[PDB]
Structures are given as C-alpha cells and as structure tokens.
C-alpha cells in the first residue's frame, strides 16, 4: 500500500558524474568509457552567453584548457568533438565504472529519473515528467548543467536528458545525449519562453484507474461523455487534448478494472469544473500527470492469497 | 529555482543491499562490513507470523538455514546474533563497498530517503518524513522489508529506518539499526493500529518561509495570532500544537526573510479555515509538512550577482 513519486535508484549514474571546467566556468560532465559528455556552453566566458558562436570559441581551445576530475582523479583531455549543443571530451581514462547504457529521445509525457549534480558532485535524485512544452518541471540551480536524467531497465541506464539552462519562467531546458535541444530552444542567455503548458491527460487518466484499483474510487463515474465534449471542458483548464491513442495507451487500466475513459474523463470533467471538494485522492490534493501506465501498476496493491 | 521533494543519491546504499532467505522466507539485508541486518522475521514461518517467540524459533535455525546472496555471489553465515527485532547475520565476506556510516535514531518530524528494495535489488527511492504517530507514509509491498531509510552528510550515511511491517490502515512502521520499533508496534502479524496522525506545523511552517523567498506571496500575513490561538484553530485540523522551541528551530528563517511565526501561523490559520482558493504554493496545492528547515534552503533560488 502507499503511493509516492519515486525515481530509480541512482548509484549507476552517480559513478559516471563528474566535474567539468574550463576556464573559470564549471559544470558537471556524464563520464562514459573514455568520454565525458558536457553541455557545450561550458567553453562560454560569462559576456560569451548573450550570442556565442561555439564554432569559434571551441577551435580557440586547446585540451589543457580543460580540467576534469572525478573525485580526487585528474582526467586529462586528450581530444574533443562538439555534437550539436554537447561537447564529447575524450579523456586518457575510461571509466571502470560505466553501466550498461544506451541513449534515447523521450517523448513529452514520458517520465524519467534526474540526478541534480554540482561541482561533480551527486546532490539528490527526483522524479519528474517532460511536459508538453518539452521544458522539465525541475529544481536546478546555477553549476546544474551537465546533470542528466535516466531511466533503468533491468540493468541497462537508458540515459534521456541533459540539462543545460533555465528559462525566465523558472522551468528547465535542455537536450537529449546527442545534444538535440528538447524545444524550441537555444543555449543561448536570450529573451526565450516556452509554449502553453498542457496537463498531461493520459497521465491522469492512469492515476484515476489506479486510485480505482487501490481503493480511492470516490468521485468515480456518475455520468458519460464524448471524446469531443471533454476536449471542450478541457481547453478551459489547459488541459491536453484526449485522442484516441491515448485512449488505447491505457492498455490493461480501463480493464483489469472495467472503467471506461470517457467514464473516467467525465470524473476529471466535473473535479476541474466543481473541484475536489475536501477529500484527496491518493493524498494528493490536486490532479497529477506525472504518473504513466506503466509507473501507476508497479506501486499498485496486489491480491493476497489465503 | 523549482522546488522538488529530492531524495538523497541512493548509490552508496545500493552497495549494501542483498536478499536473505531462511526456508521459504525472503526479504532484504544491509551488508556493512561483515554483517548483514534484516528484519528478524525472516525466521517465521507463514503461520509463525501471529504470535511469535523469536527467541525459540532461532534457537532451532542453523547457519546453514540462511541463504544470502549479494548479486550473483553467495556470502555463507558463519554465526548470529538477535538484537531486538533486528537479526545481525554475520558473513564469511566483509562488503567492499561499504561506505563511511552511522546509526542514528531520527525524531517524528525528521525527513529521510528510502531505498525500496525486493528480492535485494534496488527498485527506486523517495523522500519521506516520520509522521508524529512515528509511522511512515512510505510505498512498500509485501517483500520490502529490509528496505532502508538514510540521510547523507557529506559522504557519511546515517541509516535511521528499517522497514519491517505494514498497518492495516496502509501506513509503514519500522525500527532503527540496533532494531527498536519506532513507535508503539510489534513484529506481529496482530491488529494494531498508530495514535492520530498530527500534520508536523513547523515543517509547514519552513515551506511557507520558503514560499516566501522565491517569491510566492499569495496569502502572506494579513493578521496576528497568540500561539494559543492557532493551537486552538489547528486542533479542529489535526494539526500538531506549535511549541516555542518550533518557533526557535526556523532559526534563520522568521529572520533572513523578516516575517514572524505568528503572522505565518495566522496566513496557515485562514488557509486552513477558508481554504486554498484556485491558488497554489510553490506548486503544490495542500499544505507540505515533509519539508525541514534544511531541506527548504537547499533548494532556494539564490541573488545573482551583477
């Protein structure tokens, strides 16, 4: 029983952090095999952040300009490749302790796990979701870039995020390993802003089936509605448009329990419109999009034979 | 700037954790040095598990009854000792990787992270806090005991919780390391249930303050209250009396921002009354109690020099 946000564990990721400095400007680098992976913007002096041609300023640097340490350990850079917004820093020592990993590109809606580091050194790890407007709902403070997000399968890290920068808004952006920026963003310290953040529809959905297996079933169905008309109520309350395949994404929730979307969708229509009353569900006390499918049935309570 | 319930990094935990099984009876262990602590009811049988004497059924088990297993490695008992409900199994290998720790009891208030465990591998972590009736909202299923909870200063882990059991009422209750139940409840599969569960008003407290640094402001002081009062007010609200030394632990908080305990209880007093409206705080939409002093600072949003 209980339902909390929980992030992976994060020791596999921790033993690849570490620090990255050049210059007088330091952030945190993911250490793989004989590379480090840092967000370009580390070869940046602080006037250098309003336009930089990275082009310019990285063939100005030589590999001593570089300092890299993991803990005590000095790796010396041996050579450098800039990958879109990320620099690859090959360094003399592969790191003995690289988990079996691979890189890849999530989906806005998709969860993942980051572990907030500064200075190389592991801070604290956190749950989050990449929101609709591809920008991270995150806490990042400056010497954060380079901190990375993950998720585990089995034994492989599937490493998905990068961070980079913060917007005026307060929300995060940054890119994927291969330093494709997640947005309509720039490292660059301009006048940026994200579009409309919806809620993530689905999400709730597969939070409201999963109140329903645990118990919380209050506020359950009492009325139906056409895709359509939740899309109307819904635009009201940025709420992200339902479709159809999110409708099947649900997989084994609208059975497994025999509730429907639309049953469910017309709950979520009048708590958005009426509101929540004083009861809670799952103790939250607002509706939350940062659970998926595949997250809510693993907490989930279990039938006990007898 | 965010503002994120953060678990501390997990990996130097992950290192210690391993299964131990004795007959038909698996759960987690938490190898330092050359001894694994589990829970002492791994020795129970299905049926032991109402009213059992440890002592006895101990007595009948031998080293070999024990299997623990780190990975892929065996690691043999050589001997064991039962010091209160926890069970110290010691082992023909001293765990490489244990990190520089200690014990320590926390008090009700007192936030930690969990590492939640099945089988010995570490399936992910959260933050949590101890409630005032010394249970834990936590997430756990059955096959979790053995599951830690720890703090982090600087690179010594202080291992505070065990995870031993789950209350009919779906909340958590365990013991510290030298195995003392935190709370009034016993390792037996018996009806028991935990006092009222208080909200803890100075961890409140520190998130309003919070609140105020970065810049959320809605609902800030419009009144004055007697400590007496709000104590009045929070009784109806389960709310835990507020004390002087409450008052005393915001430290530099009521200062380093200037506002005072009582104008704050007075804004927690309508919202507690009134309600929260369609605001928000720091985004969540209920009053946060898992969040301390120390926790709140970390994570503030920091002047910029210009």
Not at 72 to 78: A, K, S
Request: hydrophobic content about 40%; proline content about 4%; glycine content about 8%.
């Amino acid at each position: 029983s209980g339902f909390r946000k929980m992030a992976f564990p994060s020791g596999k990721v921790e033993g690849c952090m570490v620090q990255v400095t050049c210059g007088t400007t330091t952030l945190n680098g993911l250490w793989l095999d004989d590379v480090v992976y840092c967000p370009r913007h580390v070869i940046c002096t602080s006037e250098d952040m309003l336009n930089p041609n990275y082009e310019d300023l990285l063939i100005r640097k030589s590999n001593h300009n570089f300092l890299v340490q993991a803990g005590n350990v000095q790796l010396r850079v041996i050579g450098h490749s800039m990958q879109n917004c990320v620099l690859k820093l090959k360094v003399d020592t592969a790191n003995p302790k690289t988990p079996k990993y691979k890189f890849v590109r999530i989906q806005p809606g998709q969860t993942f796990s980051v572990l907030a580091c500064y200075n190389g050194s592991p801070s604290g790890v956190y749950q989050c979701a990449m929101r609709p407007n591809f920008t991270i709902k995150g806490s990042f403070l400056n010497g954060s870039a380079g901190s990375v997000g993950f998720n585990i399968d089995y034994d492989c890290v599937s490493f998905c995020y990068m961070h980079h920068m913060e917007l005026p808004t307060g929300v995060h952006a940054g890119t994927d390993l291969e330093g494709n920026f997640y947005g309509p963003f720039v490292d660059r310290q301009t006048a940026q802003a994200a579009g409309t953040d919806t809620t993530i529809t689905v999400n709730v959905l597969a939070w409201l089936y999963a109140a329903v297996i645990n118990g919380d079933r209050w506020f359950l169905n009492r009325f139906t509605t056409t895709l359509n008309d939740f899309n109307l109520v819904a635009m009201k309350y940025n709420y992200e448009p339902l479709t159809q395949d999110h409708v099947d994404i649900l997989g084994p929730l609208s059975a497994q329990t025999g509730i429907a979307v639309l049953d469910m969708c017309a709950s979520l229509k009048e708590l958005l419109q009426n509101g929540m009353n004083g009861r809670t569900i799952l103790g939250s006390a607002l509706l939350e999009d940062e659970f998926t499918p595949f997250d809510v049935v693993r907490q989930c309570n279990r039938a006990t034979l007898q």
